[PDB]
Design a protein around this ligand. Structure first.
Ligand code: HEC
Ligand code: HEC
Lengths: 76, 76
């Protein structure tokens, strides 16, 4: 594979300029628009990945309830 | 509290404050001390994962040569 092609499909997700930051734990105001999407939508996004969040959120054995509880914890 | 143990196992890696940034593509000065470790050592680190980088760097089909080429591409 071409170095730039590997970069353009995978490594750029985190190694490019202008990567979107994660909503930080206990930043209630940043979490409000996320929580408004609904917990089921947010849990699905953790499982499928988004931007610099890899699919599964680095939690190999997380249940849906584990993901929901972690989101609730971070949101306040 | 519900969610804190999951957060402390997984989500804090990116959702806490003070997370180490990725060395950015074409940031030659950031890459210099990494390249000095040896390209093979950097390839092994991508495969193992490190901080907010998951094992494999989100490349499933990358040979060691594919990883080396991607690192060279980012390094200048
Ligand atoms: C976000 C989910 C990432 C993807 C996709 C890739 N990388 Fe990454 N990388 C990332 C972070 C946050 C860091 C810094 C880690 C730390 O805590 O220091 C890195 C670092 C590297 C390094 C340097 C390793 C070192 O010992 O200094 C290399 C060589 C590296 N990353 C290569 C790499 C390649 C080739 C990827 C695409 C296949 C790739 N990374 C994806 C975050 C992320
Ligand atoms: C870095 C490797 C991450 C880990 C581990 C987890 N998350 Fe994450 N998350 C991260 C980033 C960079 C972002 C922003 C994505 C973007 O581009 O918008 C996020 C975002 C979330 C979201 C919000 C999704 C949305 O559509 O706005 C949620 C609900 C989320 N993250 C939850 C979550 C949980 C529960 C994790 C532990 C199991 C977790 N994340 C880990 C980066 C990373």
């Amino acid at each position: 594979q071409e170095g730039k092609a590997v970069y353009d499909k995978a490594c750029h997700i985190c190694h490019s300029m202008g990567v979107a930051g994660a909503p930080k734990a206990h930043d209630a105001a940043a979490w409000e628009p996320r929580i408004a999407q609904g917990l089921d939508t947010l849990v699905s996004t953790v499982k499928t990945g988004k931007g610099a969040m890899p699919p599964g959120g680095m939690c190999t054995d997380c249940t849906d309830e584990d993901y929901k509880s972690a989101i609730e914890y971070m949101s306040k």
